């Protein structure tokens, strides 16, 4: 595939999440997370897969960073594990900070920028024992955990990310139950969504006083919605799913509040939002430096479901079942800019899952090479239209634990043989590296 | 003496009036009683018992007034249609009321003066107020009925339509504070009337898109730029509450963003849940318009006050002010247009009202109202700077064309650029009218 | 200590209450908001912000209150049905509201207490006031709708019906002076509301004559006897003006006659022509009734005053009660005489009579001997009206227990049973026992 | 059936529970409970039944007490609704105490002894938002809520019951998920069981200094277990089921700690109990004044290779709950409980059956319920004839009510309730029990 051209400002990188790659779940005082409890609960993860070992990134980070530098990747988005820092109540763990200190010093010698997510769904179980995100105090514990990372690790970090996909943590974790902690109460799920948004604002406030001289933001994931027909009832359900997946978190960040027509819809099946206190939407909407965009696929939604009356039609698609629709990314970037305007935008997560197979010591994943190129072209058209797209982070650097589906989905440009823990750079990874060098 | 302000090519100047404020002839040709006829004739409600019984008698002198606007060379003219003249009783079309506005529009067409017609300028028919008025959701449908009739029988002579004029006053001054008609004092009824007013606007725009009228339609909202009296955190918060009350409550719903949520939850704490907002009402109110009319007059320096149990605000005294006690602060106009642009974007904007009230006394047969010259010149200056910044300002309507009934203050406030001596009904063009007329010609003859 | 009064055998004693003033529990079982819920929660409208939120909690303690009537031996009991409990919203029949009054009536049935049920004691649903309330003629139709449902669902446990209670206040105090719900101040609207209230009474009687209810139906009016302050020809004229305002405006239309013509044409001079009296409305209002309820408390010595622009009246102050009301028992006799001269031999009932006194319980006992003298005096005056051949058939003491005295809140104690609102405890005053002994004396007299 | 004879000390009564009987959930400040959240969650309670109205005891309590005194019932066991007292965090609601102060004086006027349960599962949702019984703080809020009841209502209460069936609250509410709050985490369930036990000990300590004159205890439910056959693996499974149902709470209350051989099986399936702090079991074992036995049926258990404990229950002689009517199993139960508690006074606080009661021509003849009551009453007499400290028998229930996850489909009461009329029709079992009381 042809290489795609971008301005000099443009920034490339890969993305990982702590619990999906790190492993070493008992090492150096790490406390139990909600995903340790969930994956070890029978019937919750595909084939009972665990994050016990994962990619052993806790021990093989030096090689993985060296693999990044050898390919010349300019940046790296990873996450800091809250349980490694605060294993139990009010107990800082210096072995947790010292690990992430040695990881950042490895990124600096390789001359690799670091975007670090503070919360990527691995909430400590002791906080879950205290109600977790249904409890408003959790939003205040995250601010203190955010403030410590600012002081102890700030110098070696370029950009901070407070939350990754609050839609999943709130609704998949407390509404549908397919994610940790696995609750199925929709009042609790929308209550968690407000406290997550509230916890984001408190961390942005603490960051402005944190003396850290870098950028701060938040990554939201979007699933573009296209009505199944020109019908009024299908165009109606498509607008409901758009507010659910794409508007519920972005607009409060943008200082607009919750989507009002959709909120009165939610309160109708639940009740009045007694968890929205006076001043929360102002704290939630404290100005950030950038917005992280996580796109993967679009949805086609027809009318139907006692909650929102929605039904998505199955998908040319990913092993996740996700249809590969590249311009839906351009349509998404265009709509986001209508709400965000000139604020810098990074694609913090984009990729696909294909049935990767290693033959003759080579992974010939032609499908991902085409996927990366299609969305890179789609990302390029948004740059030509004047959109403030600053970077594109590839998901993922290496195959890892894809949550409820276990290790059955290999999103990585580097093949990981989980029995030998050997990193084998796929053909899609070398193509990305050529895209890096071609840009610079 | 002031220098004239240059504007882009298709900038549209004009003057604005209101039906009940100028027309008079409240009993002629079967006109029904309006809420302002009932309000002004109720003792203690209007300054010295003044009413709009006669006003400027524009119902009889409209040809002289139109020809005076042609002589002065005014390209546009904003006026309102009196709902009682068209539907004097429940479901009764009045042809004589429609015929008058038909005669007026023919005079404007011959004079080559563009027409911007306001469908509701506060004169609700009393028979609708007898049925609950704006507190009743049925009023929004009767407005969509009367709005749809005007599109068909009068749309050909009309360039642009304006659904509502200053919904903030009709809702909160007529149902909350009670200083305007109908004079109610119930804040739940006020915010309920405000929603039904917004609902009637969306219904009227929906009716306009199916009306076969090919001109523009919009809404006129009045704003009051707020400035915190101090950098104090309690004064900054109050100024935010005042900003949401006056400027955000009606614009943001029309702009498809819903009510300001933080301020609405405070309103609900003082009153209760908003049981009058139904599903789909927000989308209806947010029906796309072609332009937004902007009414600006002054600012307000807001300081917090726990004495006010509703919103906790206090407005400081304006020296350098008008006869309404309104501070003359032209920079606030520029800063308001910039914020409206940040909300509306590239939506075309019109200043459908701007002016001042000054103690005008005709000496030697003409009014040397130098102080109004400086008001119009300073704000057109601030208006032009909003254009040079890239703002989509498309016109400017001076309020008013002639002195008229200034609502609760009666005839003791002279906003016009033409003096009206109500004893003889003689119109005397003031110095403001001459300067404003020269500003048109200078804009007309620029290369 | 007073001697008991003798009355004919068929004479019926009882006590009277009203829904909103005693029931409380205004959010429970789907009850809709009434105009008095909205009025009392509006600041400055009721003394010290008192509301009927809790009141006597009769909604929960009705069995204990009925049993207390049984213990004291009260033969009859007058109460009103809260319209919001039956129709909380437009076209929404609430079975829980009908179920409560079903439970209360069966409790009165077991205690052998005849029931007089008032259909409208001022607590109009706010959803009806949102549509104009009594200023809208549609309200009269909805009242005949709600009255017709009470006839069929509850008529079996109801001995007599009372359509309206004191329409003079609901119309003039609610829409003219504004001291009562809905708190409007428009005298055109007040007299318009008074006609629709009279019209709603006629429609409810027509519905009753076809309702299959085998009991009586009537209407309750409040009268204030007026005596001229002097012999001056203007004080005589002013007392005539007040007499027509308070006593004649509703009784005479009900009694087959029309509105008092001389006073009406003065009202029309102050306002305008009565365009709300359609032909046939008088015939509807004058639908024959079975009895007339009489509410009487005081007189009023009236002197002419030029400062009153409306009617030109001045009431002098008054030996009187905590309401500031003179205790003039002979005025009751003169009132019943005048009503008889108008209504003839139509059966008469005193549906309300009592006084407010500063009852303070000492040693667990309220020695309110002043209320003893009040009831005994007026019962004597009522006995004279019987001795003259007057068709007075009953006497209802207002009230059974201390309750929400409307705008004056809980600062006026009219009941014969003291209510401690902190514990909701009921303590029968000395007035309750004397009045109870008056029952047995009438029940035990051999004839 | 002939009336059963008992000593003069013996004390009869009927039992109810707040959420099952009261209704009026929104009235006078009652906060949301975990059973309001659970009932209004779809697919959790049979046919979406709720305790919204229930028996409307909040309004008919005078009628019900008068009906009890008409039948001459010596005692009444009910529960105080925690949400009525503390609707939200740190907010005493005197209206909640006002309802229960009127009910007690109604019983005192009728000369009826009152046994009051402080917790009958209706945990306030604001406490559940803080993690509920998985959070140790809940055990300390319960001690405060218990200490308040002692000072404000102590005079009108003869005996207190701290908890009712902690086995169901812990394991059905947090392990199986069929009861509120509906979690399915087995570590959370045993963690909740310890905090429920811990909350009982704190409430007993608070009572010993409460200045209340009466007695305090705990109500524990038991299901006697007999192995399916003589088989050694059925012998083992019946012992595991025995410790799970009957030993996990009674023995810690008796100062014996958790059943060790069963606990190490539990730690095998989960992990070491990190929630048992030193000194807990000492507080747990605070000496009580009586023990409340809740018996309904036995269980027949055979081995089953169940990944948790390896148990399988088997079941012509069953009620509408599907429970075998085994009167002799009650005697076997009381003998074993006496072997553990010695001469501690024992009250049967709940005992009854659910039969398909049907009213024909204004009266119900539940002759199966008279047989059930008289069967266990004879089994109760055999225990005291052997020297057992059985001092009271409480029938469940006084009237039909909301039977939790089954809604109103099970009528346990001796007074029929037609939930559309709310009329109380005394059952022919209530006929017999009122005469059995009069005979003794
Ligand atoms: Ni004329
Ligand atoms: Ni109640």
Residue numbers in the entry:
A (entry chain C): 3 to 306, 309 to 319, 323 to 447
B (entry chain A): 2 to 319, 322 to 450
C (entry chain B): 2 to 319, 323 to 451
D (entry chain D): 3 to 307, 309 to 318, 322 to 446
What does the paper say about this structure?
In this work, a novel β‐glucosidase (WP_026963033.1) of the glycosyl hydrolase family 1 (GH1) from the extremophilic organism Alicyclobacillus herbarius (Ahe) has been identified and investigated. β‐Glucosidases (EC 3.2.1.21) constitute a group of enzymes that hydrolyse terminal, non‐reducing glycosyl residues from glycosides. As a particular example, the evaluation of the hydrolytic capacity of AheGH1 towards the most common isoflavone glucosides found in soybeans, concluded that the enzyme can efficiently convert isoflavone glucosides into aglycones, and hence, it constitutes a promising candidate for the enzymatic production of soybean isoflavones.
Crystals of AheGH1 enzyme belonging to the monoclinic space group P21 diffracted at 1.98 Å resolution. The overall structure of the four AheGH1 subunits is identical (RMSD values of 0.05 to 0.08 Å over 356 backbone Cα atoms). Electron density map was overall of good quality, with electron density coverage across residues 2‐450 (chain A), 2‐451 (chain B), 3‐447, (chain C) and 3‐446 (chain D), except for a short stretch (P304‐D322). The metal cations are located at the dimer interfaces between chain A and the symmetry‐related monomer C and between the B and D subunits and are coordinated in a tetrahedral arrangement by the side chains contributed from two histidine (H61) and two glutamate (E29) residues. The molecular weight was determined to be 99.7 KDa by gel filtration, consistent with it being a dimer in solution. Regions which show more significative changes in the secondary structure correspond to residues 272 to 281, folded into a gamma and two β‐turns, and residues 409 to 416 that form two β‐turns instead of the more common α‐helices. In agreement with CBG and other GH1 members in general, the active site pocket contains several conserved polar and aromatic residues that are typically present in carbohydrate recognition sites that binds the nonreducing end of the substrate. Based on comparisons with GH1 members, AheGH1 the main active site residues present are: R79, H122, E167, N166, N296, Y298, E356 and W402. Based on comparisons made with GH1 members in general, E167 and E356 are likely to be the acid‐base catalyst and nucleophile, respectively in the reaction.
